[PDB]
Every structure is written in C-alpha cells, then in structure tokens.
Amino acid sequence: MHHHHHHLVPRGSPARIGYYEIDRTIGKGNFAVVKRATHLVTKAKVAIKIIDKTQLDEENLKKIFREVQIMKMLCHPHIIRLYQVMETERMIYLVTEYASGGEIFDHLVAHGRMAEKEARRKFKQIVTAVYFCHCRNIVHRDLKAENLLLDANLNIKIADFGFSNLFTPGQLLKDWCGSPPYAAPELFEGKEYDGPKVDIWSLGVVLYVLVCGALPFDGSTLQNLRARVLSGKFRIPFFMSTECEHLIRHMLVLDPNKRLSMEQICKHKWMKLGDADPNFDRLIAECQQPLNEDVLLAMEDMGLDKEQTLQSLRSDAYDHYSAIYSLLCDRHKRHKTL
C-alpha cells in the first residue's frame, strides 16, 4: 500500500546552535523557554534553557548570572547538571542534563502513589540533593513536584534554580518564592524567613505528595488555599505508617523553628526503616566536607586540542571544550563507544 507521510503545515528545518539541534519545547519560564536538543557530536540528549536578554532590564540580568554561578557550584547525581553556557550578543544558552522521565507528579498520575518503600528511596535521593545545596549555602525556595525530574532509571534530579538564592546561616529573606501550595505559612503571611526552614516545609509537602498522591493544602482560589495553609491541618490516609506520619507531621509545623533540621530528618526512624542504607549515609557525610584519559584521547582524535581541553577543565569555564569532556565522560560510564 504505497503512500507518503506529508506534514500538514510543511514543517521548517530544525534550528541548530553550534552542534546542538533543537527538538521541542520542554519548559517555559519567566524570561526563558527550555528546549530538548541533541548534541550532534556526542549524540547525547540535553536540555537548553534559552534566554532572550533583549527584553530584560539590568536587574533581571544579574539575577540570571546569580543562578548560573549557583549551578556551577552543584555537581551532584540528583541535581540537574550544567554542561555548558553559551552567550551571544542577544541570547544566553544554558545546556543542562536531560531527564527522560519528566515531572514526577505527572508520573504519579500515570502509575499511582508511591509505596512507602519506594517513596523512602526517592525522598532519600531528594534530601541528599537539598542537603548538598544547604551545606554549600544555597536554598532552592521552589521545591515543587514540577521541579522534581526522573531520568530513564526514575532517579530524582532537582531542577530550575531560578528562585534559588545564596544565604548565610541566620539571614532573613524578603522576596517571595515558588509555587504557593509548597509555600511555608510565613511566605503567605509575608514575614521574613530563614531559607532552609522554608525549604523544609516545601520538602514536607513533597513527602506527602509521594506517599499519599494528594496535596496537603489546596483551594479553589488563592484565599482558600491560604486559609488551608495557615490552619496547619491536613488529612492523613489510613495506609500511612505512624513513623511516616510522625516525620511529615513534624516537618509541616507552623512555627518555623519547631520544624526539624535537615540533620535529624536523615536520622528519622522512618528513614532508617527497611534495609539499612550505607550509600545514603555516605552521601550525607560527604555534604559536610580524575583525568579520564580515555575520553581525552577520543577528543584529541576528533581534532579537539589536547592542551585547550585541559585549560577549559582547569579554568572551569563551561565551554565547547569542557562540555564535550563532561558528556563523553557520562557516556563512558554507560559503557557506550567514544
């Protein structure tokens, strides 16, 4: 049955940004669009956050540089990984790791709520990510289901540090952050707040979503949701363990100081349940604190300058050279060719 497959509006040719080939929009931002793209050289898949600075005042531009420097600080298996930054007279391109699984919340809609054994595994991965950030003086401030992503193995990757900010222990912050349902009651009231304690509440709403498949606080209008957040009251389904209810009930506490610290959340009885986890305690210990020559030889064969490659890596400028090393390195762990 001979036939051709024609495209109604003849679709134009794909855009390319210097070895990247843009596929589809995968995110929308305040001043950005996120597009999935392919690195033509390494065949790897990546996300690219694309920012049009023409429409930006000078303030917005500094906030974006702050975000970029924060991202440079975080190389963590459960934090989205920044591969390279490109800038032109007019555009800023952020090339970050691509998460095949997508939003966790949509994934739950498809497959239902998490059995606590599962929820414990992922939450452990999330906390190692957030603890790593807090230990390095950063707060996400927008920890929501939508910013929690899954790779092909369904491991967490936190993403979109646009609302993230640097902080010193005990500073107060004045600007609002994040999605309202994951917002701690102080943000609604508008008080100044300590950064990590507001993430803890957001991490509380996250845990509830994982085990129950529901939101603790929700409303038809912002005022209604606002009422529900301030009440500090929520449903607990019968299937939840008492240790989990203890954990969540003590994370989602209206008094910011009455909230647990990140250190005892890792020690909480619910976390210790199940088979003992050495790898978890290791990543938590690491938070307080070489020359893959195979890839190096491969890049030289492709004609990339051996000396310049080393200079890009040591200088830590995320450029055309460092990104190909990082990408070929991630491919080399997968045991694929070079």
Next chain:
Amino acid sequence: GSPARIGYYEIDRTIGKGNFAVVKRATHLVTKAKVAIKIIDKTQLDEENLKKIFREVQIMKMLCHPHIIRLYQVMETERMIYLVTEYASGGEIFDHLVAHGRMAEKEARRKFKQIVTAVYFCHCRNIVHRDLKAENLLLDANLNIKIADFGFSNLFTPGQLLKDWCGSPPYAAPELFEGKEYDGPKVDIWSLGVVLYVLVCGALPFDGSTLQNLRARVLSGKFRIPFFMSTECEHLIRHMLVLDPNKRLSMEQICKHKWMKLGDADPNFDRLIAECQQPLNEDVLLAMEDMGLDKEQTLQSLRSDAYDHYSAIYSLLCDRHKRHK
C-alpha cells in the same frame, strides 16, 4: 479545565502520536475499564494552540453518538492536559487495511454507512470534523466504526465560510490547497470521498513524493478507478470527489445513493439518518450509590457538565448497563 488525581488510571502503552500529544491506553482503576487518554504537554502550546484544544474539548462535549468516540473525563496538571475517551478495541481502519488489504464493497458499505451517520450527526449539530482519514477511523469490539481526533473540528453556521487550512493533505479538498474560503460540510464530503476510495481500493486516490506533486494530483481531480469496483460505487465516488464544491453530493444524496441502497434493505440505517434532523438511567446511580459516593455531588457534576472522576465512573458504568452487566 479541572485538577488531575493520582491513582485513578494506570497508563500502559502508546496507541497514537499527535502533533503535541500522545495517546496511551489506560485502565480506569475503580471500574477496571479500558480507556484511551490523549496526553498533551502544555509547555508546547502557544496561546493559539491552547484555545484550539479548548474548542476541541468543547466540541467533544456536544457529541454523544454510537459511532463517535466518547469523551469521559478531562483532567489538567501544571504541564499536561488529559483527555480520557472511549477505547476502541479494533483500532485504526488504516491498520486493518494494511493487515488485510482492501475491503469488499459489502463490508465497505457497512462501515461507510456507520461513518456518514456520525458525520451527518455532527453536521446537524453545526460541527465539521475536517480531518477525516483512515487513521481517525476506529473499530470497537463489535467491528463498529468510531470517529476520533476532533483536533481540527470546528463549529459553523450553514452558509458560513471558514478560512484556515485543516487536516491530512491526501484527504484535503482542492480548495484547501488553493487557500480559498470554503463551506465546511463540502470539504468533509470530499474527505469522505477519499475515505471511500481508500476502503474499497486499499489505495490512495491522490499521492506524490513531494507535497507539490501530491497537490498537483489533487488539483487535477483525476484518479484511477480499478476494474474490480462496482459501477455503482464508481458513480458515488466520482460525484463525491468533484473539484467544484457545489457540484458535490449532499449528505442526503449520499445516504439515498444507489450504492448505499444495494444489498439487503437497512431499516437501522435510515432510522439513524432520520434521527439526525431533530435518558437519565437511574439504574447505575444506585450502583454508584453503592460505591458510597455522594449522589448530590455526582448529579451536580452531570448537570454542571464538568467531566471529572464522577463523570468518568458514571459514563463507564453506563456502558456496562448497555453491555448487559
């Protein structure tokens, strides 16, 4: 829109791909029913495309018909839009045509009769599908037609003209290629002409390596007619696939056409056709009353016409009462 809920469906396998959507087979957890879900990524939609699906969703609400796919529930999340519709076990007609070849005119008529009743039903309701292709023709377990993908469907008032391009190019009437303004029902009819040719011949009436080649082919209005085709069928098609839109048959003339009337007499066909010119089922409500869910809120869901988890379980159970469960 309306908020999505975790643990009401279990999505399993891809069954279609669309411009900005994927359709996946899923099972309704409460009723164990099988359903199809079109999943749309809102990040991929500009403001115009967002309104387009809202129009599609509004149009699906208007149609409750045995040969039109039924929309059960609409769900939305931050990034995704969910359309939960009736699942057609037989699948695409296109798939069936690939697997088994052209259809004998006897069966082609059985299917085609079912198709026009749906298309005529839509037209009677001031709706035009505009994308009628073998890929949007589905079969249920009884091998009955179900029309699908009202992505291009649009409302109209008789004698209004429409301006935007629509649908698959092989099934496009020559005026859409030319870019002229057009009467909606007349383009549905050409598109149905191509469908009939596809069913009876297992071939495309118009095709080309490039869109320009194909376009030239449609504009010529000339096509092959096989020797194995009945003289009556050729007449029908030749009068459907007419370059001058006004010169094409009306849907009334299509239903009364000599090819349609061939074979054994059809009371059920003419009945459905008549129905197009111009039922609360309390039995399930007690079954739902048995699930302990609030009768007052369910009735408000049905009157309010908001397609939620209440509407889905009602519509699904209602299908069980037709199934004789």
